[PDB]
């Protein structure tokens, strides 16, 4: 969209990076490739756990990953057995010793990545978008959001021509760098094509 990405324009203001590792030009590209590969693998296996965001850092010659989820039971289960296999496989793919950590994020409905997935999941199960999206809105504000905005684009309802529909409630100042906006997207693969979902959540002014 012609609007600059909120999660990219505030990286140096109120949005920490999802990767905090340092490296020279000799291995910067290799580190990027490893990070992308591990993220792509992990997000597929942990689809049920509803991972919000995955942060990766470089301890003293090793790989450390921290995944924030609202359903730590699936990834933890009994003892650390379900995380041991994930640790060993991520270490295998990264080529260096790995350490994975689980973080709990309560009130999942207030998370952008998560709210979207909900929507997309629903749509994929032939649910009326209009209402899928309206609940998302209400849910959130109930929880306390100072604002929320939802948008869905594509062949809504299997129509012959694509259409975009959005709902905005509360206050969502996109030009205020002081404010923090949790922005995220998500896609769906329905029999009629691909439907894009896009959610902004405004939590505070600073």
């Amino acid at each position: 969209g012609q609007k600059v990405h909120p999660n990219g324009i505030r990286l140096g203001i109120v949005k920490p990076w999802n990767s905090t590792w340092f490296a020279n030009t000799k291995e910067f590209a290799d580190n990027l490739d490893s990070d992308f590969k591990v993220r792509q693998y992990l997000t597929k296996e942990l689809a049920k756990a509803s991972v919000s965001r995955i942060v990766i850092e470089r301890p003293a010659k090793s790989i450390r990953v921290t995944i924030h989820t609202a359903r730590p039971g699936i990834v933890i289960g009994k003892k650390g057995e379900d995380v041991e296999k994930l640790r060993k496989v991520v270490a295998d793919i990264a080529g260096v010793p790995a350490q994975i950590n689980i973080a709990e994020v309560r009130k999942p409905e207030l998370d952008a990545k998560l709210v979207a997935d909900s929507i997309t999941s629903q749509l994929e199960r032939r649910v009326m978008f209009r209402r899928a999206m309206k609940r998302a809105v209400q849910n959130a504000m109930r929880l306390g959001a100072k604002g929320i905005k939802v948008e869905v684009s594509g062949r809504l309802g299997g129509a012959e021509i694509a259409r975009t529909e959005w709902y905005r409630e509360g206050r969502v100042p996109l030009h205020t760098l002081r404010a923090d906006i949790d922005y995220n997207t998500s896609e769906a693969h329905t029999t009629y094509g691909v439907i894009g979902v896009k959610v902004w959540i405004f939590k505070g002014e600073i």
Partner: protein, 98 residues
């Protein structure tokens, strides 16, 4: 004698790493000159934005590589060797040299 250089991308994380280094160095010994600012590297990139034509649409990016330098001339070695290996350097690059 022993000069230490730290590299990072953030300006305050390097400051806290240097503060930790100097505090531990003065605790275990003496003769600390404090961190030296030195120049900061500004790696500038520019990338075309549109996936097709539209040459004018461009985005400018820059990476701020911050560098700090601190040296110690402490005589005793049992303090410097103890200072090493106990500090995580706030998870940013650091090098040991004579």
């Amino acid at each position: 004698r022993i000069r230490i250089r730290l590299k990072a991308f953030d300006h305050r994380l390097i400051d806290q790493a240097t503060a930790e280094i100097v505090e531990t160095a003065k605790r275990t010994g003496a003769q600390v000159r404090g961190p030296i600012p030195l120049p900061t590297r500004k790696e500038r990139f520019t990338v075309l934005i549109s996936p097709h034509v539209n040459k004018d649409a461009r985005d400018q990016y820059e990476i701020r590589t911050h560098l700090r330098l601190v040296d110690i001339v402490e005589p005793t070695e049992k303090t410097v060797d103890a200072l090493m290996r106990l500090d995580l350097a706030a998870g940013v690059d650091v090098q040991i040299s004579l």
